[PDB]
Amino acid sequence: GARASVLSGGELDKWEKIRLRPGGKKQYKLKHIVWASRELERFAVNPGLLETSEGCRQILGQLQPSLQTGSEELRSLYNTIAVLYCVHQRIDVKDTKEALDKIEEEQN
Amino acid sequence: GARASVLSGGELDKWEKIRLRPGGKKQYKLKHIVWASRELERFAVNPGLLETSEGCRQILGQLQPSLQTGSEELRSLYNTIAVLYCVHQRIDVKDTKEALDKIEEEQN
Amino acid sequence: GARASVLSGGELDKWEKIRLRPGGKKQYKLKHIVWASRELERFAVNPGLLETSEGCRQILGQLQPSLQTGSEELRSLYNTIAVLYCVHQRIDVKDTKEALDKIEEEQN
Ligand SMILES: *C(=O)CCCCCCCCCCCCC
Ligand SMILES: *C(=O)CCCCCCCCCCCCC
Ligand SMILES: *C(=O)CCCCCCCCCCCCC
What we know:
Radius of gyration of chain A: 13 Å
Order of helices and strands of chain A: HHHHH
Largest sheet of chain A: none
Shape of chain A: globular
Organism (chains A, B, C): Human immunodeficiency virus type 1
Subcellular location (chains A, B, C): Host cell membrane; Host cytoplasm; Host endosome, Host multivesicular body; Host nucleus
Domain Immunodeficiency lentiviral matrix N-terminal (chains A, B, C): 1-108
Oligomer: homotrimer
Structural class of chain A: mainly alpha
Largest interface: A-B, 10 and 9 residues
Bound molecules: myristic acid
PDB class: viral protein
Protein name (chains A, B, C): Gag polyprotein
Number of strands of chain A: 0
Number of domains of chain A: 1
């Protein structure tokens, strides 16, 4: 029955097709979700917000003022959650860069 | 002479009568103060502010914007300091829930 | 060729003449820069901003709202970056206190 959570065309299937770099080989994996989860706890943010569009949207709001001075860890976290937001919104992005384009396009 | 800091009806005596849950058995102990202290240091906040009404009020102000997305650790910290604020204000709350009621009632 | 980075009258030479306390003996050393660097990473702030006037200015902006409730670690970090800002600006401060005077004087 496990196969119900890994349906073709579903969120996890989509996640694992998205490329890290706009013109790159490597793709998002389960370990990127696990890592994003740990990071939010270190930042005293509820990791359960990763599960929904609205939760990802609120996280991205919390993190946005910190982006400009933020370390690489912080920018990577923001980029990862932007991709998760697109997956939950069923927006068909091919890479991290398109996810960022969509998010800042939405904020307009 | 130690008994001067644990006077009947004093702050520590009151602290240790307050219940964690509105309808629960367990009560606040010294270890909850110790834990709140460690947490504020992790957040780069002066733990000495726990000693006064005004310091607890300023901490609660710093933490309030983080509550909505905050982890359980963060909410627990806020709840604990809300109870400490009530003790320092000599407001006779019976549990964490009444402390929260009083704090947000005061902010009106 | 290493001597090109430790020119007399240059930034590192100036740094290591500045006194920690307004009327004190001890002076800023390399370990204070190393420590400030680690601290910014713990705060998810890009340590590379320590390298420029503008980066130090942005860090000080990020940290300023946290100063009033901040722990000693936080105040020490702010004080150290204020001195670095003065060195990068070629402002000839003799101690931490003069650096703080200059920074808040500039913000007027
Ligand atoms: C419900 O749909 C049952 C179908 C059979 C599920 C098989 C999945 C087994 C996965 C093995 C563990 C993976 C270890 C890498
Ligand atoms: C001043 O008021 C002196 C009165 C005697 C103080 C007795 C307190 C002793 C506490 C023992 C340590 C507690 C260990 C759990
Ligand atoms: C370029 O200017 C070459 C001049 C010679 C450089 C000598 C510096 C050596 C430093 C020794 C390491 C310091 C260990 C405490």
